[PDB]
Amino acid sequence: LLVVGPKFIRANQEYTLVISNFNSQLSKVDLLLKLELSVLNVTKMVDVRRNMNRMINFNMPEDLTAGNYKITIDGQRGFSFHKEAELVYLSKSISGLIQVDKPVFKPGDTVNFRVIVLDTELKPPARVKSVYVTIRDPQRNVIRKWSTAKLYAGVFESDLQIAPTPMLGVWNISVEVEGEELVSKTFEVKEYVLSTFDVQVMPSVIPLEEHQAVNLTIEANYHFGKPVQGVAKVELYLDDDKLKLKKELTVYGKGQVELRFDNFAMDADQQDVPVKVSFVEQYTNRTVVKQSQITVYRYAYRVELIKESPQFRPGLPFKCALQFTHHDGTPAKGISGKVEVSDVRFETTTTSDNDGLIKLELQPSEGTEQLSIHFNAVDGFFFYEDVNKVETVTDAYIKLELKSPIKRNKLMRFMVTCTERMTFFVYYVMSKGNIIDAGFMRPNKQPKYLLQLNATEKMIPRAKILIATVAGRTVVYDFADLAFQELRNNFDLSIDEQEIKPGRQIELSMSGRPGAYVGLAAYDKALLLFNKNHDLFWEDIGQVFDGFHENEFDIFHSLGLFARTLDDILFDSQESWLWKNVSIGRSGSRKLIEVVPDTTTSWYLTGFSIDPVYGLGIIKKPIQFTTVQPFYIVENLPYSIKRGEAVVLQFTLFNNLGAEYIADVTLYNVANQTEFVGRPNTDLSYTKSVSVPPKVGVPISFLIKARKLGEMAVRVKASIMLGHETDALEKVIRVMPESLVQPRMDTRFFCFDDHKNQTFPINLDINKKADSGSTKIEFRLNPNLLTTVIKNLDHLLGVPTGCGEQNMVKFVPNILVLDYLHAIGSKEQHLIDKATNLLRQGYQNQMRYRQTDGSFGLWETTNGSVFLTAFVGTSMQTAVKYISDIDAAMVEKALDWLASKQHFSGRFDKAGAEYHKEMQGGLRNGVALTSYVLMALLENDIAKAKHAEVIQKGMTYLSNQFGSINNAYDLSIATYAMMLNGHTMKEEALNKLIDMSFIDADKNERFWNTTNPIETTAYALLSFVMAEKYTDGIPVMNWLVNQRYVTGSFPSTQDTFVGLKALTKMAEKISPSRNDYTVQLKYKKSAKYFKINSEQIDVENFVDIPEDTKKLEINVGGIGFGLLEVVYQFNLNLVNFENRFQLDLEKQNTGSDYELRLKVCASYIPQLTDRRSNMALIEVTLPSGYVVDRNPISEQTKVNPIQKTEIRYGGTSVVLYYDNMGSERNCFTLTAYRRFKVALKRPAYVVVYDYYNTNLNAIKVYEVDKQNLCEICDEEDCPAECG
C-alpha cells in the first residue's frame, strides 16, 4: 500500500489524500482514516480495490486555530497496517521575504532593505495593500517603525541611517501582517577596531611535479582593507624525508615566494604538502600563523565519469561523458587521449571538447556484465571506472520526461521510463500545496509508458507532478515542474560578454513582462565570505519559487507532502553597488547602464522580478565576474602631526598587469603646506620612481614637514607606462599645535528697536604670557544666536561627551533649534531638515543609556539616575513634535520609574553614581534635584497632565523648604519650576533670587556667582522671561552671551542646554520684527563693512580676520538684532599645571624602542567638605606617530573603576571616564606602539579634569625617546647635517 497526502493544512482548502493499492494478495483492502488540540475529529470507513487508487477529500472547517494535527491510517480486518503523519497547520496564505543590501554594516552607513510579499500564486496579494515593519537594535529598542508601509508590486523598500556611535550587535528587521509576524531578518553592525589582521596563503600557479617547486602568494590585510607590513617565515614540510624547507621575506601587504624541491617524485598522482606561515607585524611584532595543505599534482588535469544513471541497463544505450577539469575546477579543453571500452569493442581517439567533455554513447548487449571505461593519454595519464548493470533490489529507478510543451487546455505528454518492466506506476499532481489529480496506471509489463494528462485550471499557473512505483521492495520516484510559460514571468538578466573593468561602465540587459518590477543587487563575495553561515537572500528567494526545505533531500518534504508505505518497503533517495529597482517597460526589455566601482573584487549579481499579474520571476543562477584594478597605490598615514616634526609618509604600490613596470609617484605641495626635507620651499611637487613587479606590494615614501596648522592635503599621483595606467589619492593629516589651544570668545549683542547709532570699542591685549607665538584672532558678525550653533550642530563642544548626560548634545540642541525656528515661523527649510535629521540620529544614540529598569544611566550599563531619567524622558516627549520615531511606551516606562522614586514628602534623592554634585547632592535637602524633576515635567504638557500627582507633591515640598533655600543654584531651579507651575510663591522666589544677584557695572552685566554660574544665571533668565522682566533681563543676557564657547554653545553640557534655552527664549521676545543695519569694523588703518537687511538671515557668514593689532572699533547703525564676536586662538606654551588634582606620569621600561608603556595616576585634592570631584575624565595624548592597540589599558586600580574607555583620532587619543575622584590613587597603564617614523617630535601630555568644573584640572607633559632625523630618512633626501 502507498499513502500520499499533503503535509500542510489550511482553513478552507480541500485536503485530498491518495491511497494506492498495488497489493496482489487480496481483491480489496479496508481502511480506517482518523484525522485529528481537539478541534478536528473526522473519520472515514474507506474501501480500496486492488490495482487501483482511491482519492479521499476532506473539507477543512473555516474556524481552524493553531494546534496539533494528525492523520492515521489503519488496516481493518485481515490486514495489518498502521501508518501516521504529522500535519502542519498554516495560518496565512501569504509568504514574506526581506532583502538587505549587506549582512554587516559599520557605524557610518545606510541599511537598505526590501520587503517582498507574495501569495500562494507567487504574486502580490490582492488583499494586502500595506505592511507593518519595525527595526530594533541589539537590545530591542524600536528605532524605526513603518506602521503602514505600502506595497508596490508586492515590494516595500526603505532605509535606515546608522548612527556614528550605534548599538553594536544584531539588529532585527521585523515584518508584520494584521498584527502577526510574517518575516523577520537580522543584520549586524560591527566596529572596524579589529586591529588584528588575517593572512592568506595560496599557490600563485598550480603546483606540478615537473616544476620541482612551489610558488606561493602570501597576503596580509586588516579587515577594513589596508595592507600590513611584516616579515613572513614560510615553512614547508616533507615528512617522508624528515625535511623542512624554510624562507623569510618582507611582505608589504602581498608577497611571492618560491620554494624549490630536491628530488621530488610522488608515489601517487597527487601529494599534499603542509605549509606554515608566521606573519610578524612590523613594530608591534603581532604574530598571526596560517597553515594549509598544498597539493602538488602530476598532471594539469583531472577526469571524472559523469553518468546519465548510476548503473546501466543490459540491452539499452548508456549515455555518459568523461569530464576533464583543471585543478581549479574550470573545464580543460583540447585534452587528447584514447578512450576504450573493451567489453563492447568500443574505441575512440579524440580530444576533450570546448566544455571539457568527451561524450560517450555506449551500447551493452544483454550479455554484457559491466562496462570498463579506460582512458589513456600519451603523457602517461590513465583513468578507469567500471559501470555495473542495474540490480532491482538497490539500483532500480523510474524517470519522467516531458515530451511536449505545457499549455492551458492541452494534453501534457510524458515518457515514463523504468528499469523494470512495469505492472503499475502512479502519478500525482499538486498545485498550491494540494493534490489536484492522481492516477493508477497499468503498463502491460513495459519499461516505457506514454503518460497523457489534460491540464486543468486548478493546475494553473504553476503545478508539479510526481510519479512513483514499487521496484523489488523499494519505492522509486521522479518529479517535474509543470510551468505554463504563457502565464509565467519570464525574467532574465545578462551582462555584456566582455571583461568588466573598474571605473569603466557596463550595460545590464534584462527582459520579462512589460509592467514587471525588477529588483537588482550586487554583493562582493568578500562580504559574503565572513558571514555566509546565516541565511542568504538568494537561497530564500529561489526556494520559494519552487517548494519547501538537515539530513538528506526528501522529495515529499519539498513537494509539500508525506508518503507512507508497508513496513518492509523502503523509499529511494565597500559601498553598495547596483542596489537599483527598475521596470521592464514597453518592449518587454530594459537596458540599465552603470559605472563599475574602482576596486579589485569579485561580484555576485542578482535580479528578481514581480509582475502584478504574472508574479515572481527569477534568474537561474547569480551572475559572477571579477573586477581587477591594473594599478593602485595605498596610503598609510598618521592621524596627526605637529609643525616642525619630520614625518615619513609611507605608501604601497600594487601592479596587476602581466609584467614589471617602473612606477612614478608624485607628492604635491598643496597651498604651501608641505616642505620636502632637503629641497626648497618653492617646490610644488616631488617625484620618485620605483620598480613594481606583478602582484607584489612595493613601498614608497616621502620625508616631509608641515608648514601650516589645520588640515594638510596629502595629494598623490602614481602611474606606470607613461601614464597609460594611473592612480591618485586625496587624503588628510591633521596638523596640530603643541598645547591644546583653548579659544576664548568675547561677545557683545545689540538690540535696536528705533533707529540707533552705537560705537563699540574693543581692547584685545589681555592675551599673552611668556610665550604665545602669535595668537590669531577673528571678528564675526552674526544675526542670530543659532547661526553658528546650527552650523556646528554635530560638533558643538571641544570636550568629549561619551556619558549618558553629555550625550544629550546630540539631541537637545536640535530641539532648541527646531522649537525656536518654529516660534519665529522660519521658512529656511535646509535648517529645519538638518536639526530634524540629527535629532533622529541622536535618538538612536541616546537609547544606549536606557537600562533594563526602563530608566537612563550615566553608562551603557549602570543603575539609573533620576536626573538623567527626568532629563531624557521629558526631552524625548518634547521631541515627539518633530520626529515620529520616538517610542511612546518607552517614554512612559521611564517617567513611571521616575515617578516611583519620589518620596512621600515630594522630594527626589539621587540614584546611581554622583557625577554632578550640585544637582544630585543631598546636602541642601534635595532642592536642586526636586526642582529639576518638577521643572522638566512642567515644560511638557503631556508629561504635566500624566504626572499631576508628582508635581503636586513636589510643589508642596518646595513650599515647605522655601525658607531654607539659601543656595542660588537650587533657588534658580526652584523659582523656574514655580514660574512654570504658577505657584503662589513664584513672585516671592524670584525676588529672593534677584537679591542674591551680582553686578558688573562697567560691563552692564548681571549674573549669579555659584560654582556653576552659567546654569544658575540661565535658569534665572528663564524666570525673568517668564515674568516679562525684559529690561532688567538685558544685563543678564549681556553676561551669558559673553560666556559662550566659540561654536555658539557654552563650553559644557548642562551649561549649553539651560544657557541656549534661556538665550533663545529671551531673544524671541526682545528682538525687532526686522533687521536693517550697517556694521563698520575699523582697525589700525582699514575698514570693513557689513550690511544685514533680511530678518530671515541665518545661514550667513560675516567672518573677518584682524591681524596682530592692539585695538578695535565697531560702529553699528540701523535697526535690529546682532552679535558682535571676537574669537581668540591662543598658542600658550605646553607646561605642567595642577589645580585641585594630582597627576603623575611615568614611562615603564618596555625593552623596545617601538613600545610605550605610560603609567598614569590621578587623584583629587580634597579640601574641607569637598572630598570628591564631579565626573572626571582623563585624556591621554600620544606623541606623533604612536598608536594604541586594541585594548590599550592594563593594571587599572580597582577602588574606583574606569567606567568608559574611548579611543579617538586614529588611536592617537584615549579618554577615560570616572564617576568621580577623591584622594585614592586612580592608576592605569597605557600601551602604545610607534607606527610611523617621526623625528624632532614635540612632547605630548596627559590631562585630568572635573567635567562640570573644568577649572579643577591637572596637566603633565611627557617625552618619548627622540628619534634622529639621520635614522629617519632614506639616503636620497638626507640633508646636509647628517652621515
Ligand SMILES: *[C@@H]1O[C@H](CO)[C@@H](O[C@@H]2O[C@H](CO)[C@@H](O)[C@H](O)[C@H]2NC(C)=O)[C@H](O)[C@H]1NC(C)=O
Ligand atoms: C523603484 O521603486 C519605487 C517603489 O519602491 C518606485 O517609486 C514609486 O513609483 C510609483 C509610481 O507608480 C509611485 O506611486 C510611488 O509613490 C513611488 N514610491 C516611492 C516611495 O518612491 C520607483 O518608480 C522605482 N524606480 C524606478 C525608476 O523604476
Ligand SMILES: *[C@@H]1O[C@H](CO)[C@@H](O)[C@H](O)[C@H]1NC(C)=O
Ligand atoms: C526578530 O523579531 C521577531 C519578533 O520580534 C523574533 O521572532 C526574532 O526572535 C527576532 N530576532 C532576534 C535576533 O531577536
Ligand SMILES: *[C@@H]1O[C@H](CO)[C@@H](O)[C@H](O)[C@H]1NC(C)=O
Ligand atoms: C615560480 O615563480 C618564479 C618567479 O616568479 C617564476 O619565474 C616561475 O616561472 C614560477 N613558476 C611557474 C610554474 O610559474
Ligand SMILES: *[C@@H]1O[C@H](CO)[C@@H](O)[C@H](O)[C@H]1NC(C)=O
Ligand atoms: C619586535 O622585534 C624587533 C626585531 O627583533 C625589535 O627591534 C622590537 O623591539 C620588537 N618590538 C616590540 C614591540 O617588542
Ligand code: NA
Ligand atoms: Na540622580
Ligand code: NA
Ligand atoms: Na565678563
Ligand code: NA
Ligand atoms: Na623624535
